[PDB]
Amino acid sequence: ALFDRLGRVVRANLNDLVSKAEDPEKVLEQAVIDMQEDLVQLRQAVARTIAEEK
Amino acid sequence: ALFDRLGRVVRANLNDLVSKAEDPEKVLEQAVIDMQEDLVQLRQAVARTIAEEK
Amino acid sequence: ALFDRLGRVVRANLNDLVSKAEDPEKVLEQAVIDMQEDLVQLRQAVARTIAEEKRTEQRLNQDTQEAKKWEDRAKLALTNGEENLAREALARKKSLTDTAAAYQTQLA
Amino acid sequence: QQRTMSENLRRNLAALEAKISEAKTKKNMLQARAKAAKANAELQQTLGGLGTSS
Amino acid sequence: QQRTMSENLRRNLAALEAKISEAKTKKNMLQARAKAAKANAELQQTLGGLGTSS
Amino acid sequence: ATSAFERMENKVLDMEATSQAAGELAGFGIENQFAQLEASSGVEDELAALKAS
């Protein structure tokens, strides 16, 4: 369908835009806050299964 | 989603800004007031459990 | 394109202007400050690669002393008689010696 | 059944924390290798400028 | 039950105070090592300036 | 942990500055051999005094 070509060009445009932006320090600080938010939410889920155990 | 790249660049910008600022004396004085506020609030929580004991 | 002829004449004008200026003493003093600025910036770049060498070497030392502290913890678990703690201390040594070997490979 | 699940979740957390902390320390190491490669690129670029000016 | 909890909280406070006070004295020690490393960097930088001026 | 990372990176910068200062003497044969000859001759003079005693 016609929407497909518009999908390819917008995917190329957003890849160019992000690629122009990306740097080592920004990805490092993002990666530590990503793992902190994943870890605290997953430890809250463990606290719910521990609460059902107790 | 598109917001992701804006998150990476703002995380890199705030890491550059804080990194430019950070010094040994400022982190030492912050670390002693942080532990004093944690300790006084936690001792107030112990005073509540002692009050329930008495 | 038309801009080409304007490029040729401005290139001729700036070559005439610099040629009229140039002298042996000015080029000598410029050449020594040029090599001093190149040398100090390049030695700062070497100081960054040396700092990464010493960073990865101190990480290797920290893991290898921590691996010996997990052998001490394994010995303490064996005198306590706690097999699950001795087996966890062995798994700590196996994994931490693998991270030590990764830091040693990077350091090599 | 809840305690065997509780230990299984503890194993899942311990494996996840190990692979996350390994991936983050290796990402910092490869970023330091990339910083050294950038310094060697600056060294060769300035050596080219020393060549043309000399 | 309240007195066994009251002693358990006393143990939690005693362990927390021990690890906080250890971490703060070690942070002061490593900051003093970093001050000595900065003094050795100034010594080598001024020795370079003595070299070029001599 | 966050303040301990700032302390750690400051001490890593002191170790890289110390390595750069040691590299300024690495392969610099005149100062390197002068320091080696001063240390070697100082030990030989101390042993010569010990043999004389």
Check D43 against C42: CB less than 8 A apart: yes
In angstroms, the CA E44 to CA E39 distance is 9
**E28 and F6 in contact (C-beta within 8 Å)?**
no
Give the Cβ contact number of residue C50 at 10 Å: 22
Question: CA–CA distance from A31 to each of B1, B8, D21 (Å)?
Answer: 17, 9, 11
**A26 and B12 in contact (C-beta within 8 Å)?**
yes
In angstroms, the CA C58 to CA F15 distance is 10
Chains that touch C (3 or more CB pairs under 8 A): D, F
Q: Nearest chain F residue to C52 by CA: give it.
A: F16
Give me the resolution in angstroms, 1 decimal: 7.0
Which tokens is C1 given? Answer: 């394109």
Residues constituting chain A: 54
In angstroms, the CA D49 to CA C34 distance is 10
Method: cryo-EM
Chains that touch A (3 or more CB pairs under 8 A): B, D
**F22 and E43 in contact (C-beta within 8 Å)?**
no
Which tokens is F46 given? Answer: 């101390």
Q: Is E41 on the interface with F (CB under 8 A)?
A: yes
